[PDB]
Design a protein around this nucleic acid. Structure first.
Ligand code: 1UV
Ligand code: 1UV
Ligand code: MG
Ligand code: MG
Ligand code: MG
Ligand code: MG
Ligand code: MG
Ligand code: MG
Lengths: 208, 482, 482, 210
DNA sequence: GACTATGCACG
DNA sequence: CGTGCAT
DNA sequence: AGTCATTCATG
DNA sequence: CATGAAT
């Protein structure tokens, strides 16, 4: 599963959570091995609100993930005894990419709350176009095109330049602004109860 | 180099993003052609490729890869598994794909791998695609922005009800059972003539689902409820005969089972009853189905209350199940729970859009020619002078300009005239042309009427629906009771 | 209802069937284009599909499936795997397929699945296909009997030596190492002037293999033996610098490794020595390769004999290995152990048949058009009369007998004239035609010369081989020693 | 793995050894579940002339053939204790089909000599063509007076298979009999043996590359 | 979507 | 033992 | 070439 | 617990 950094270093070391064995592969290649580890997420991450805390611990991606971070889960969780200064969720810029970010984020909010509130949890924004553009508004300005359908079609030297280089990468930091407004938001989108979600979707999703 | 966002704000843009997509563009059928985008892409691709009911089968892998590179940017497996399902005659009431080779069984052993099977569109599938080449349906760009693709098919029959749909998404799900082609068409034809038709009356034509696995559907009241609100729980029970055996013993013989039920797992779950002896009296369970018949024998013991056993199996197995209607579909880009009425209504509205679109197209074609033909009929009256004008012109462009200015030909005719091959000069027969001028004027009058008269139009629509019924109609399989 | 067969008279027939096939049509390359059939099909197919270096990438699944349904009736994965290799620049000296996305590594880890990757022919492969549209190569029917495929490609460079092969059949196997494209061409060119060239002379142009993986090759003697008999045993040793570190510690650094060797295993197997203390003084092994450069640091302890460590690693690991030539290929349909001369000769031979075939094709084209142009030149001076004559004809055919009978045009000329679009009568310019007629006569002259003079043809074949060398030539990667 | 016949009976029961899971599954559907058993041969089968009897007993196909025919293997092989009266090898009609037949046969010869020597080992001849059906390019050209070119078993639907190859009263069927016992040991050893030179030479002497 | 075992020839 | 087309 | 797990809603 | 398009 895990491809580890060469040297153990809490202050610098970064953990990359890639959506896919395929992209997990371009990551092993493009990365800087001295301080960047790679853990592929092979398939959709379990929902850690809907499922039972029984089947939650018997989950491969949940085990190797609590164990590859070395702080343990729940409230038996020491953020001081971590293994990475940063943890980076890197997915396709697609819908399912989005969904995955959404499930990983609930797991960390639910079972490693310190990590997110300590600002150690990030999300990599890969490019949408190719100079490189992230917005359809950043492209038309670059017209003065190859359209990336996912990480799988990007080459190692490119991935590094655009989204893995700690000096060339755009990088989103997850923060908890209003703790209690984040418990509702999360419990409604990811909870066991369907009806509240439908209403949320109805009220916020513009089908046009 | 690094910018932060709220948890509250990141779960928003992510889940809304995904939700919207998985609702509008994955899990749920367009209310008019009954297709989820993957199925549509599958049919449109195979069709563009001429992989049709009348032509040699293609290797599935060729088709699948072509779908994947042109339209559906996802798993080759997902795409295949979809293709395979549209070809299983026990999941679809009317299969849209014909596949040579192992494509599975009611025992639910997996189909042969994409590399082994061949396939083509079924004849009926073509009817879903009828007239697509006449600009009858809105097209969008593919993911590539290299090729257009249809957003809905022309649906010459009403697939949504005929074939069904299921049906899991986010905030919504869908379960629509299949129905008899003839019954559905009969209902739609009635609604065409009677827009404000009430359910009770539509149900004289379309009395219930018609599973391709047949069997017994119980609950006239809930069928009504469902056709009304789009939700409703009905019962589906297996067709059972009882044979006497030379010993004072009896045998329960199953011949049809409930839609979506796995024959192999049923047989096992029943033998489990026998093996655990939860119920007294089961002697043997025998799946006796061959390549041309379904048949499960439940041999009972002597002095063994066969009513008691049959009832137990109906309760504690899938020998009898409940089927839940949850008719959700996409009307106007939106997920919408709907019953029999907005479904037939949306269909009819669609077929109207198509027939109008199609007639405008054919008409525009007829006109463009009738226009040319007029020009030609003239040219002959003045052949000598037109050749002289070209002879005197400097080049295609100049010649066209001269025909316009000197003889009031239009561009379109000046083009036609100037690009005629020399041999055409041999001819002077104005009659044949005139015959075509007539045939064309008539065709246009016919098509204009359709476009300008709501009733003429609807009449055509009925006519066509009926042809489809005469051609593809087949008897019920599932019986009804309450 | 049943026929009997001997065990002998069976294994005979059966194994003989599989023996023949897996030799001629699977595991061994054609001596001319250097391709096994699966490779040739991939190439022919992608090319037919316009999937070339100058145009966008196609999703791989699309390329594969088209291959599998048009030419190669085997596993989709085998086809993909093959295609992937042709794109890996550490196995092919001159890669035939370019591929976007994870396509493996020297660390041996697996490429992304066929659904993720995009691909297209490299510009070089284009030259492997050059002139194929021109009837320059023998075609056969495909398994379907629906489409013709080529049995061998035109090969505008000598692929077999340049990219190598390998190689496991039945009763025969093959290993041919890759070679510097420019050197092979230099050899071929000499041999063209000097048919009877001894191995020694050829070796002044083609001194040995050039691995894409680089490194040091040792054994002039065995290289000759190989280039002479098809078999030989040479030694490949890793390229190695020695860096000083602070604290009186030294570091063995590896920058290139031996062909066909897995970097990742090599690294373990070395650390394996350190762990087992098999040789005194290793501090730590570290693969420090990164996206732009290979690099293995074997840092050793203080006061450690660095020449002892290096020597041990060379002997007991794969930091240095034996490459064995086993140059086998398919000549006149038979497997054939072959050295440098049967190869280059067969290549030249083939390059001959192709240039000859091509030159007829083009001549014949140019002849036919010259014929039409000759006719169009006369027409101009009698334009009016011709128009008049057509006007006076009853139809197309009659216009031609009339053009013939009255002006001695040929059928082919008459047809051309009579099918001219009217606007052409504004293009009445003899001198442009007279310029083409000249262009044309010269072209025909040049090609006829090629066809009727072996020397003239061979110089064409050299002009071209050189053009290819100038265009694709690159520096040696592997150094030699004896 | 194995699909058993619904009624034990060494007198009638047939064992079908099918090339590959896809077609094994088509056969599962087309069979007559009362007396026909299916056992998929998933992949190319181990050469029991080359490999070491150790690596042999540890190969899942050989083990699950020997232990479903219920007669053990080798010299401890009671013919009377078999399970099937007809063992049917059914492979695609392609070269690699031919290759498998080669490997399965060498195995029975080598480790179940009594089973073939008694005429209990058959070979199914699937159809090559469909326009009806034809087996020989000659049997074909006669039908065009009275073409789907079957590229393998996985391209046929079950009602098709049963009628042409599985139905006992409609199938053409080969019987592997041993004529010259000592002239087989040599024919087998040359072709499937460990030594390579003889096999190269036998190929040179018998295969016409034309 | 990565994993697992075979054939074949060769040091 | 590992190579690469095959099952 | 089959096999393994997860999302999502519903009874 | 199974459903069917998705990872
Ligand atoms: N009994 C064997 C163990 C597992 N295995 C494979 C396999 F490992 C790889 C593969 C493949 O890589 C592979 C491919 O398409 O490249 C195909 N097969 C199947 C046809 C045998 C494989 C099989 C067959 O299944 C049985 C055998
Ligand atoms: N962690 C899970 C256990 C095994 N598994 C599957 C799988 F079972 C099926 C599939 C598929 O059937 C399948 C398909 O294309 O149909 C794809 N995948 C991969 C993308 C996840 C699958 C994966 C992913 O690997 C990991 C997960
Ligand atoms: Mg994606
Ligand atoms: Mg799957
Ligand atoms: Mg029940
Ligand atoms: Mg494989
Ligand atoms: Mg060594
Ligand atoms: Mg085959």
């Amino acid at each position: 599963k895990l491809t580890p950094a060469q040297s153990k270093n809490p202050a610098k070391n970064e953990l990359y959570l890639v959506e896919g064995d395929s992209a997990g592969g371009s990551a092993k290649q493009g990365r800087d091995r001295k301080f960047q580890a790679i853990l592929p997420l092979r398939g959709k991450v379990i929902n850690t609100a809907k499922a039972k805390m029984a089947d939650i611990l018997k989950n491969e991606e949940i085990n190797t993930m609590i164990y590859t971070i070395g702080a343990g889960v729940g409230a038996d969780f020491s953020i001081e005894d971590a293994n990475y200064d940063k943890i980076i969720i890197m997915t396709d810029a697609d819908t399912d990419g989005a969904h995955i970010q959404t499930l990983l984020l609930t797991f960390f909010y639910r079972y490693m709350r310190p990590l997110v509130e300590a600002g150690h949890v990030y999300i990599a924004l890969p490019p949408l176009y190719k100079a490189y553009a992230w917005t359809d508004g950043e492209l038309e300005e670059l017209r003065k095109l190859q359209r990336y359908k996912g990480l799988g079609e990007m080459n190692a030297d490119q991935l590094w330049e655009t989204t893995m280089n700690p000096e060339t990468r755009t990088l989103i930091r997850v923060t908890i602004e209003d703790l209690a407004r984040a418990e509702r938001r999360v419990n409604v989108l990811m909870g066991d109860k369907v009806e509240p979600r439908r209403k949320w979707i109805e009220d916020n999703v513009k089908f046009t | 180099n690094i910018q932060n966002m709220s948890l509250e704000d990141i779960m928003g843009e992510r889940f809304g993003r995904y939700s919207k997509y998985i609702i509008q563009d994955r899990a749920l059928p367009d209310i008019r052609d009954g297709l989820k985008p993957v199925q549509r892409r599958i049919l449109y691709s195979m069709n563009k490729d001429s992989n049709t009911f009348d032509k040699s089968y293609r290797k599935s892998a060729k088709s699948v890869g072509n779908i994947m590179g042109n339209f559906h940017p996802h798993g080759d497996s997902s795409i295949y598994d979809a293709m395979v399902r549209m070809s299983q005659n026990w999941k679809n009431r009317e299969i849209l794909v014909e596949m040579h080779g192992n494509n599975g069984s009611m025992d639910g052993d997996p189909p042969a791998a994409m590399r082994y099977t061949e396939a083509r569109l079924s004849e009926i599938a073509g009817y879903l695609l009828q007239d697509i080449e006449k600009k009858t349906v809105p097209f969008a760009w593919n993911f590539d922005d290299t090729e257009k693709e249809p957003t809905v098919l022309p649906a010459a029959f009403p697939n949504l009800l005929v074939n069904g749909s299921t049906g899991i998404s986010a905030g919504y799900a869908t379960d629509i059972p299949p129905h008899n082609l003839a019954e559905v068409i009969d209902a739609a034809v009635y609604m065409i003539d009677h827009p404000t038709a009430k359910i009770d009356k539509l149900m004289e034509f379309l009395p219930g689902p018609d599973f391709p696995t047949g069997a017994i559907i119980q609950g006239r009241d809930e069928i009504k409820k469902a056709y009304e609100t789009g939700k409703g729980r009905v019962v589906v029970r297996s067709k059972t005969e009882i044979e006497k055996l030379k010993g004072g013993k009896e045998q329960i013989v199953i011949t049809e089972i409930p839609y979506e039920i796995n024959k192999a797992n049923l047989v096992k779950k029943i033998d489990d009853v026998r093996v655990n002896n939860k119920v007294a009296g089961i002697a043997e369970v025998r799946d006796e189905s061959d390549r041309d018949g379904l048949r499960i024998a439940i041999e009972l013991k002597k002095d063994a209350n066969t009513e008691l056993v049959l009832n137990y199996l109906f309760k504690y197995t899938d020998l009898q199940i409940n089927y839940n209607f949850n008719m959700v579909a996409i009307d106007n880009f939106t997920p919408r729970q709907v019953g029999i009425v907005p479904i037939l209504s949306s269909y009819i509205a669609h077929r109207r859009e198509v027939i109008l679109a199609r007639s405008r197209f054919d008409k525009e074609k007829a006109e463009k020619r009738l226009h040319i033909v007029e020009g030609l009929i003239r040219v002959i009256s003045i052949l000598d002078e037109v050749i002289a004008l070209i002879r005197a012109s400097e080049n295609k462009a100049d010649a066209k300009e001269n025909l316009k200015v000197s003889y009031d030909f239009t561009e379109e005719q000046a083009e036609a005239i100037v690009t005629l091959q020399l041999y055409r000069l041999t001819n002077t027969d104005v009659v044949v042309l005139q015959e075509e001028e007539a045939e064309l004027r008539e065709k246009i009058a016919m098509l204009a009427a359709i476009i300008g008269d709501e009733r003429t139009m609807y009449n055509l629509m009925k006519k066509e629906l009926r042809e489809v019924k005469k051609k593809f109609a087949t008897p019920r399989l599932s019986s009804l009771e309450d």
